[PDB]
Amino acid sequence: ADLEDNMETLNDNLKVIEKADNAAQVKDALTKMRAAALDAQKATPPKLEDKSPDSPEMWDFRHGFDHLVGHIDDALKLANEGKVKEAQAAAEQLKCECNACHQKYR
Numbered sequence: 001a002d003l004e005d006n007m008e009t010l011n012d013n014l015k016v017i018e019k020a021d022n023a024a025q026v027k028d029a030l031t032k033m034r035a036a037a038l039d040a041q042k043a044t045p046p047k048l049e050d051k052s053p054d055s056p057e058m059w060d061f062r063h064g065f066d067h068l069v070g071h072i073d074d075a076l077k078l079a080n081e082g083k084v085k086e087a088q089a090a091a092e093q094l095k096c097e098c099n100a101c102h103q104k105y106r
């Protein structure tokens with residue numbers, strides 16, 4: 001449950017959503033992402049290892065996962081309503097979140 005493994009979970013399950021052709025597989029990938037992002041939110045990334053947990057950098061690092069989970073839930077709702085294609089498109093826009101946090105802190 002460390003940061004690199006959670007990121008492996010996020011990356012793998014985004015590719016799963018991208019190639020999926022059914023709702024069950026999209027839904028399982030998304031809920032798995034949701035869990036991995038909440039667990040990642042507890043880690044300290046290598047480039048913030050000198051920071052206090054209440055620093056603005058650490059606050060912003062953690063809050064990035066709230067935004068990510070928010071997108072995941074939107075996609076989760078489409079995917080529970082059976083709209084696989086809309087859910088996949090929503091998951092593609094998650095990529096702005098990955099990129100945003102990465103350019104600041106990876």
Ligand code: HEC
Binds near residue numbers: 008045046095102
């Ligand atoms: C901060 C709020 C993050 C968001 C959102 C996402 N990622 Fe991330 N990721 C983050 C950091 C700080 C790091 C560096 C970790 C380290 O220990 O060096 C990463 C790294 C990755 C990696 C590489 C992991 C590795 O084994 O080196 C991948 C493949 C990755 N991140 C993917 C990824 C995806 C697909 C995300 C959105 C669905 C995503 N990350 C969001 C911080 C944050």
Ligand SMILES: [Mn+2]
Binds near residue numbers: 063
């Ligand atoms: Mn915010």
Ligand SMILES: [Mn+2]
Binds near residue numbers: 067071096097
């Ligand atoms: Mn966003």
